[PDB]
Amino acid sequence: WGYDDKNGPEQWSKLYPIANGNNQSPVDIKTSETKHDTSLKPISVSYNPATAKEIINVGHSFHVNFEDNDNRSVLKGGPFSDSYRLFQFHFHWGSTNEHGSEHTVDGVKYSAELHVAHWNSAKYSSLAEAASKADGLAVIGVLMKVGEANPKLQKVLDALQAIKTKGKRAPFTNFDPSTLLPSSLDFWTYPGSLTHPPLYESVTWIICKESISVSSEQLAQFRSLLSNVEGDNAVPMQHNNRPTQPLKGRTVRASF
Numbered sequence: 001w002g003y004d005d006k007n008g009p010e011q012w013s014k015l016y017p018i019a020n021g022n023n024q025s026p027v028d029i030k031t032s033e034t035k036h037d038t039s040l041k042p043i044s045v046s047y048n049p050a051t052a053k054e055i056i057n058v059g060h061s062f063h064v065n066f067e068d069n070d071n072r073s074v075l076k077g078g079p080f081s082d083s084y085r086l087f088q089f090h091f092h093w094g095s096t097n098e099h100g101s102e103h104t105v106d107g108v109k110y111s112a113e114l115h116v117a118h119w120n121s122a123k124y125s126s127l128a129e130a131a132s133k134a135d136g137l138a139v140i141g142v143l144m145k146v147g148e149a150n151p152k153l154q155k156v157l158d159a160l161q162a163i164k165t166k167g168k169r170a171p172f173t174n175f176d177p178s179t180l181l182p183s184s185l186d187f188w189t190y191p192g193s194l195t196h197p198p199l200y201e202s203v204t205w206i207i208c209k210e211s212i213s214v215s216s217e218q219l220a221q222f223r224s225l226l227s228n229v230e231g232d233n234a235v236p237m238q239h240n241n242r243p244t245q246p247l248k249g250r251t252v253r254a255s256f
């Protein structure tokens, strides 16, 4: 279902009718209309870098998958009364620097977006179980602003040369993806979804107030990943970021 136009995000509603749904992501975050809430607690990431397993090229993006067999890597606080388990981080990016981030704040589009994904291990057995569940997934979203080169992106960008093409796997160990997060975990939260098929309406978004930085060259790496299988003609992975979607009257909550 890629991000072309043949497979691209307009074609998503055919196969996945949930695309023209009510809890679709990303969204625009209109700060004027955002109802501050104080029942919210502060977000608290406790990741353990020995959970870091693998980095894999999945054709449309690349993942960094984590060990999700126990509660060693948890997110808790925010709205969540439960304690979600970390399983993955990945990125979204765009063809040019001007766009690339999925969420937008007051119409402003960013270079890329980081997703640090979690699944509700207090209520569910597997990721596979919690994938589809309303209270299934907790994803931290960081907005990535084109400027200085982020030195905490090092290990991620280094490893990329070993997963040039779709399906390529490699061990990525000994990394806490919290080091990626901004210093201010002031956050918006809203009831969302995945941003790509199967677009499950299972995500409680945590969108960070403060941005992290990425140079144009760091973004050029993301782009010089290849969507093709090894041997085939080099088809870069140019953009993998979704249009912002109607709120249909959900209430983005501030935590600031």
Ligand SMILES: C=CCOC[C@@H](O)C[SeH]
Pocket: 088, 115, 117, 137, 139, 193, 194, 195, 196, 203
């Ligand atoms: C399957 C990977 C992670 O899914 C959670 C979403 O926040 C990524 Se848009």
Ligand SMILES: [Zn+2]
Pocket: 090, 091, 092, 115, 195
């Ligand atoms: Zn994502």
